[PDB]
Each structure stands twice: as C-alpha cells, then as structure tokens.
Amino acid sequence: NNPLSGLTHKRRLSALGPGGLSRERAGLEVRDVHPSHYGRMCPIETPEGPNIGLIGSLSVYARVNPFGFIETPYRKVVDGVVSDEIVYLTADEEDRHVVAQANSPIDADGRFVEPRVLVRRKAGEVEYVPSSEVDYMDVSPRQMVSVATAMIPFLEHDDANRALMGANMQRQAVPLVRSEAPLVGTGMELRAAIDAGDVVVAEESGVIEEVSADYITVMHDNGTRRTYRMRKFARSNHGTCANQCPIVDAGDRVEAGQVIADGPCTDDGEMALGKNLLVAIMPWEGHNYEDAIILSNRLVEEDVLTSIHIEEHEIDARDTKLGAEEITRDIPNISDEVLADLDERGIVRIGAEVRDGDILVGKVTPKGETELTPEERLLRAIFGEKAREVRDTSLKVPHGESGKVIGIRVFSREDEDELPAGVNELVRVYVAQKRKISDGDKLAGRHGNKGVIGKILPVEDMPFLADGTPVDIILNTHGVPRRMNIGQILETHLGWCAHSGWKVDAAKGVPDWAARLPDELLEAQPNAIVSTPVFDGAQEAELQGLLSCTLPNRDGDVLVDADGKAMLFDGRSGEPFPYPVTVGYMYIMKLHHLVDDKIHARSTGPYSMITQQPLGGKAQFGGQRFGEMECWAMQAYGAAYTLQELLTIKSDDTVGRVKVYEAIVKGENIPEPGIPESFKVLLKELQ
C-alpha cells in the first residue's frame, strides 16, 4: 500500500496460526492490553474487526532475545544519577526492579530533581518512590508505541478508539503522482522511510558520477562504481504505483547512508503519506453532514490527490482435445474497427487506449464438432457463409477497468520460455489508470478522522480568506468533540503557524510561555517543517502564543487571530460568514477505498453450478446477497411478490429468469415464478 504498509506488515505480532490459537478459542483476556506490553508491543495498533487484540505491532525500541522473549531498553541509574549505560530487560526481569518515567526532570549532570518521582512497578501498579530506590528509567517518552503509532502528532490528545483507527488507516494510504512531506511531523517520518527499503540509500560514500531518470551512478572514494537502478512505474502487490525518482543532481557530494532517490509516498527521504491541505472547520450547506468531506476542485485541476493504479491482465493458450488454442489477430465475426488497436500477433500495442469490453489478447479455440442448429444451418445457406470451428475466447477488458496499455510480457513455449505442462503462449498486458480524486473516495487524517468525499465544488464556490485564497477541504464541526480526537485541531493550529512562519518577541526579553521553547524555534520561515514527538513536543501554551506570532502575508496583513480562527467569505452568496471560522493546514491521506473499485452492478450473468443461484463478487460479476436478515424486512413490510420474485425469477429459477428476460425485452408482463431449483436440490440431498 505504501512504504509504511510494508514496514508495518513486516513486523506483526499474531497469536493466530498453527501451534497458536483459533479465533473462536480466544476469550476476552488474550485480547486486551497487558501491563508487560509496555515498550515491547503496542497497545494502540490492532485491527478493528474480529481479529482485534489477537494482532499487534512491535514497539519501536524493542528487540528479540535468543530465547524468543521480548526485550526492551532502559537507562541505568546508579544512585539517583542517570547513566548513558543501557541494558535490555525482559518482562519478568523488569518486574523484580523499579522503573522511572522518561519525562522525569533530570540534572545536567544526571541527578533527579525531586526525591519522590513517578515509578512503574510489577503488576501494573504505580506509586511515588524516593530517589534512593530508583533502579532504571525509560529511554524515551515514545517508548511504548509502535512505528505507525509514533507518527500520530499530538497522540496524547486523541482517545484510544480513534487513535487506533488513526494508526490502522495510515496503512491504507495511496501513493500519489508526486508526494509532499507533512508540514507537521513527529520525526518518525524519516527513519520509517529509510528502513522501508522502498527508497534508494547510498551504500558507500562518494560523488554522483551520472544521473538519469533510469539510474544513478556513484563514484566511491576507492575508485569502484556502484550503480543504483530506479524502479520505474512498477505494479505493487495491490495495484499501486511504485515509482522512484532521483533526488540528487549530477556532481553532488553524497555520504554513506544518505537517501539519493526516494520512492512512492516519499519526499526527500521522508514518509509522505498525504498532502498538506488548507482546512476549514465548519458546517457548509450540509454537504459534509455525518463525516462526509467537501473538496476544492483545485485538488482535481492540480492533481493534488491524484493517483496511478496498475493492473495485471493475464491469459494463456492451452492444448485441448479439439486441437490447440492459438493467439491470433483473426477473431470470428469481428470488424476491423475493433481489431484496430492490435498488432499482427493479436496483442494490443503499447500506448494504446483501452476501455471495458475491448480486446486485449485475441485468442480462439477449436469448438466441439457438435451439430450446429438446423435454424442456423438454414441461416448459413442463405448467406452462404461457412461456419468456422473456432470460438471466440479472447481476453477482453473487465467491467470498470480502463486506461493506457503500458507494457507487454509474452512467454512462448516456442521461444524456449519454460511453461507449465499444456501451455503454449502466455500473454501479460499491463494497464495503468490515472485516477483523479472524485466523489465517494475515502480520505482521512492521522487522528482517526475518516470519511468519503461528499462533493467537490468549483474553486470559486469555496469559502475563502480575506486575500482571496480558497480553502481546500471543509470538515464538519459536529464530528470532532464526540471522537475526543482534538489532536486534529492542534495539528490545524501548528499547521497554520508552519505555513505562515512566526517570530517570538525578544524585546523586553524572552517571554515566559516560550521559555521552554528551544532556541531554534523562536524564528521560523514561511512553509517550515517541525516535529511534535509523541508525549513530547508542543504544549497548549506555546501553541496559543505561536498563533499570535503568525507572520502576515504578502500584502502585509495577518490572516488568522490568536484564537486560531479567521474570517471567511461565502463564495456563493459573497457575504462574509457571521462568525470567525477555525482555519489552518491539515495533513490528509488518500486511502485505498476508491469508488472505481467499490462500484458494481449486474442484470444477469454467471450462475452457481449446483444451487443454480447467481455467483458472488465483483470479480465474477455476481449479484448481491439477499440474506436471512433482509428477508425479514420484506416479510415485515408484507411485500410477498417482491420477496417471491427475489428468491425465484431473480435467483435460481432455471426456466424463469430466461422467460423474465424475454418478457422484458418484448415489453410484456412478468410471468408467474416457478419452482426454485435449489429446493429441488434439497429434496434430492434428503433422498
């Protein structure tokens, strides 16, 4: 799904599988958060569904000891004095000791501030304990979390329910055409990107000898040359677009371990899971009612949330009893207008455009020499056209799919390509789509704030600030305090300060609120990047103060106030909105739940081989399931004919569904349903 999708998935703690437990065997004790999980396994990251608590992620700083247990780092305190010496402890070993919390105030030498400090003890119990009894203390405030979890800014401001979803959803982010790093970070975005392996890291130090869109060559110091080839437009396991681009220019001095070229969802070696959007926290003509989302058309005209999706289409030619399947450009009863996009072999030409129903790989098979219809025999004597013994078995484009053919892979038994027993020619056509963002596409932030796109207004309709700039995204106010995830609010505040830039007042000294603020943040440029590490980083007092520090725009005017709000103009009526609206920048990710995949329908199609009912799934072009629960709703209404129809002529009535299709196309009345073939099956199974 993304450089993080892999990462998260490469390290998972599942209690499922052989030797372990089944899903129905697991009670309520196995699933919930245990005290020993601290710094070893995350308490946040776990699935929502029936697998909840049985699947988790490994905490960041943890590691596995030679016996299969989970160790975790702690700093060693000799006697009230912190020592840089670190020892890894196991679960039961820690219980015998006593551990201090990471954020406890420490002397510049290494000593504690207060005699009594916050203390972790066996069995998840906590108490104040004198400084003489302190054995160890935590490595980091963010020690207990996982990799994806630590990437959630202001985590300690969102409830575990939505913060859970905030971690899970990042996994389903989609790689966009090009990706931007978030204005608000946590610092984890770097190490995650590097350790993903889906970026290009320089092995040995040196200088870029040559750079192209194809590959990067590095001249080392000893003389040897290593060349790094770029993955260009490759299809991932999930049809997303793994595409790498060179960061460095030719002649740059590059050291070892440095990212010289990143991949999808990466901007300058950092996890770029989304875009920085100009948000507005308000109801707007109801189009964002119940967690729906309104977008600026700017995100469609500038491809800000546009993605590339690649599909692999396959088909083969086998040896049959009536001869052998051959891949040819000659398909029975097809015009030259349909075949126009093929080459001489029967394969589509690279770069060609394909819609649904069109032909990708023309294949025909020898059909059984069964007596052709006497009514079709008669029809072949009039027009004197002799029937061919080859039936159309071509690879056509599935319903919904469309795009540009971006490559062909052909494997022939003839060209010594080693194939399975029975196969002659195998063709792989690869088709990519350039899906812009549309209605129904699921977007989300890092704080469990999900939802689908309700409406995308034209750029002018958008509620805009005083200087004319239209907001990008309009989130509804109602669905914020309920979810307790007001970290999305803090992200909006800090997000605005980061876009405008700021400068604390140094005249009359350094202010008291910005006294804990490190020197480097007392002055910031427009479009600056910052870090808010979990259980550290920004506090509400500094954020409020920074909102006062907001640098004016190009016209010399400040746009938001100390509250973080600003005055908007309704792009439709023109009049200014009566009250100040909270405006800022938020990081929004494109999730992999797109309507272009989700949508599906069916009149008639394939049917079950035994029950003679419709098949199931979009892949098999099957119809929906009208379950036991839905048959109660019908029964309650008292809609007998609707209910009967659904389970008879709409389902597995062999002779009915055919005579319904005919009654419709002739414009007559729907006939009377017969006997459900499934019921015939039951009476035979009983026998």
Binding site: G187, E189, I194, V259, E520, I529, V530, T532, P533, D536
Partner: peptide, 23 residues
C-alpha cells in the same frame, strides 16, 4: 533538529533533549 544522522532535511523539534539511543 531531531535526527541529525543521515544527511536529511532539517526538521526542528519541540523537545526535551533525547540522547539515549537512535531508533
């Protein structure tokens, strides 16, 4: 800065100084 190890973009950090160990 936060991670001044590889040759990365400078991401300034609100923080108590974290020098126990790199991830």
């Amino acid at each position: 800065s936060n991670n001044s190890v590889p040759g990365a973009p400078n991401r300034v950090s609100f923080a108590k100084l974290r020098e126990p160990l790199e991830v």
